[PDB]
Amino acid sequence: ELTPSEAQSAIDDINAAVETLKEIQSEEPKADWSKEFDKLFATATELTQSLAVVAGGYQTLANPDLIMARTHLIVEIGLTVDKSANNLRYKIQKAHVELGFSVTRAIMRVANIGATVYQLNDSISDLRATYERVSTYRDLKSTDTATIYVKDLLNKAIWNTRVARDKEILTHKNFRTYQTLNKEITKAVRVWFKAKATVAECDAAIAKLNTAYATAYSAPSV
């Protein structure tokens, strides 16, 4: 009942979910949700290999309702982490602990050789229920300690500034212009490393970095 075409669509959906997850893992490596990403990716490989057997016209006796439930759950894990990364960045840490736990449980289940259709489908429901619940949690106060999600936004600004510095400032600007910008980058790096930095300190570091880059970009070329 699972046709080769349906099996290939499942493969494509799984691979798209895995690429989304790898990108987020690159940007937020210490995220609570990423504890078991290694197991998830290995399971995704086993799942697409089993699907590839069907897409290739060979016959496997692996249960189709189970393979598709695992497929739907991997897709859901991808969707959940993507929405969380994009929408929950300033939520209190409790939101991320709870959503990370839901993601971790879902990964453990999808990799579990004893998983049932009911359990996999219930994991999909739990990811959705957990996302909806923690979405209503309160936001961090600017005086709270920055979570790793806020620190990752600062890190992104640091790296964005380094990339732009090498392509636009070192290439065309004064040595003093380059060095001044590097000093401002260093100030942001220190905030990023300070374990007790507040949300406000991270937001201020981002804003100062953007102003420093603008100053350097507007400098006269030579």
> Is residue 127 within 8 Å of residue 116, measured between CB atoms?
no
Which experimental method was this entry solved with?
A: X-ray
- Structural contact between residues 173 and 222, judged by C-beta atoms closer than 8 angstroms: yes
Cβ 121 vs Cβ 57: under 8 Å: no
Q: Classify 220 in phi/psi space as left (phi over 0), alpha (psi -120 to 50) or beta.
A: beta
Q: How far apart are CA 12 and CA 167, in angstroms?
A: 35
Structure tokens given for 180? 């001044």
Count how many residues are written for the chain: 222
Q: Is 147 helix (H, G, I), strand (E, B) or coil?
A: coil
* Cα-trace Rg, the chain: 22
Residue 63 DSSP label: -
Question: This structure's resolution (angstroms)?
Answer: 1.8
What distances in angstroms separate CA 42 from CA 30, 69, 81, one per listed residue? 19, 17, 18
d(CA 219, CA 211): 12
- Nearest 5°: the CA angle 13, 14, 16 is 65
Measured distance CA(114)–CA(40) in Å, rounded: 16
CA dist 107 and 70 (Å) reads 10
